[PDB]
Design an enzyme around this catalytic site. Sequence first.
Site, mmCIF file in Angstrom:
data_model
loop_
_atom_site.group_PDB
_atom_site.id
_atom_site.type_symbol
_atom_site.label_atom_id
_atom_site.label_comp_id
_atom_site.label_asym_id
_atom_site.label_seq_id
_atom_site.Cartn_x
_atom_site.Cartn_y
_atom_site.Cartn_z
ATOM 1 N N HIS A 85 80.556 80.316 34.267
ATOM 2 C CA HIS A 85 80.523 79.141 35.158
ATOM 3 C C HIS A 85 81.947 78.628 35.236
ATOM 4 O O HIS A 85 82.876 79.189 34.687
ATOM 5 C CB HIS A 85 79.472 78.097 34.790
ATOM 6 C CG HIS A 85 79.686 77.386 33.528
ATOM 7 N ND1 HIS A 85 79.273 77.875 32.298
ATOM 8 C CD2 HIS A 85 80.123 76.123 33.291
ATOM 9 C CE1 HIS A 85 79.525 76.969 31.378
ATOM 10 N NE2 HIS A 85 80.041 75.889 31.931
ATOM 11 N N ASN A 181 77.487 68.820 27.001
ATOM 12 C CA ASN A 181 78.173 68.133 28.096
ATOM 13 C C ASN A 181 77.376 68.372 29.382
ATOM 14 O O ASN A 181 77.334 69.480 29.906
ATOM 15 C CB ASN A 181 79.604 68.582 28.247
ATOM 16 C CG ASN A 181 80.321 67.822 29.265
ATOM 17 O OD1 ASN A 181 79.742 67.195 30.207
ATOM 18 N ND2 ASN A 181 81.689 67.878 29.160
#
Length: 232
Positions: A85, A181
């Site tokens: 990602h 996160n």
Amino acid sequence: SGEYPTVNEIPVGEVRLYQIADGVWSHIATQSFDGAVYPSNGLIVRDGDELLLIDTAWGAKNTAALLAEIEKQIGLPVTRAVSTHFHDDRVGGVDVLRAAGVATYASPSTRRLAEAEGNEIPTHSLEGLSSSGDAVRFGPVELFYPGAAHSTDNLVVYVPSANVLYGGCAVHELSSTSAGNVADADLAEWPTSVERIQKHYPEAEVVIPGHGLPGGLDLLQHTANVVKAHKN
Ligand SMILES: CC(C)c1cccc2c(-c3ccc(CNS(=O)(=O)C4CCNCC4)c(F)c3)c(C(=O)O)[nH]c12
Ligand SMILES: [Zn+2]
Ligand SMILES: [Zn+2]
């Protein structure tokens, strides 16, 4: 000395490798972000007499150190890398890779998001991954797009020779108490995306999270559980 290495065991800027299976290693590095230090994982998969790298070591100097550690411990050239990602723990270091002659790859989604974020941008686009449930082969691995989870673009990686599932940041370690996160996450779709992973890779023997300790298939359900409890 053989246990999986943890955040306080790895100074920022050094990299460790951990043998997962024949021809499969994880890499572990640590980095500061917003005033705290975190560990992160990536993957190394033997590809004949070359190596496939999955994810950077979270930063330029960490990624240079990764290359040096690979040369020391394995001694085969890294020829391709895939970033799973767009965050800096996945792409930060792509410029180092690129100037070391590694061909760098990511989905078009990841490339767009990285560019918009001001992160380093893999060179080559991986088509065929835009719809949840898509899968493509890349050297000795399969790349799978499970749907939005930790991020909208997160990919997972399966090593069929070893039944190793690298979940990246869509999968959390068993000791995890929070969903990490979540700034770019889809908490509502994350369980569904995990269910897709569970359905698609029921024979996985080792599951590697984006941060923390590998385990078995239970990491998948644990991840769904922590995300659902966070969303609530
Ligand atoms: C945007 C990118 C570059 C980024 C920047 C900064 C942090 C993150 C995290 C992240 C944050 C926290 C944890 C859990 N805390 S912990 O410190 O690692 C653990 C605590 C108690 N025992 C051992 C250590 C976690 F696993 C991951 C993730 C993610 O979730 O993908 N992405 C991050
Ligand atoms: Zn991330
Ligand atoms: Zn992460």
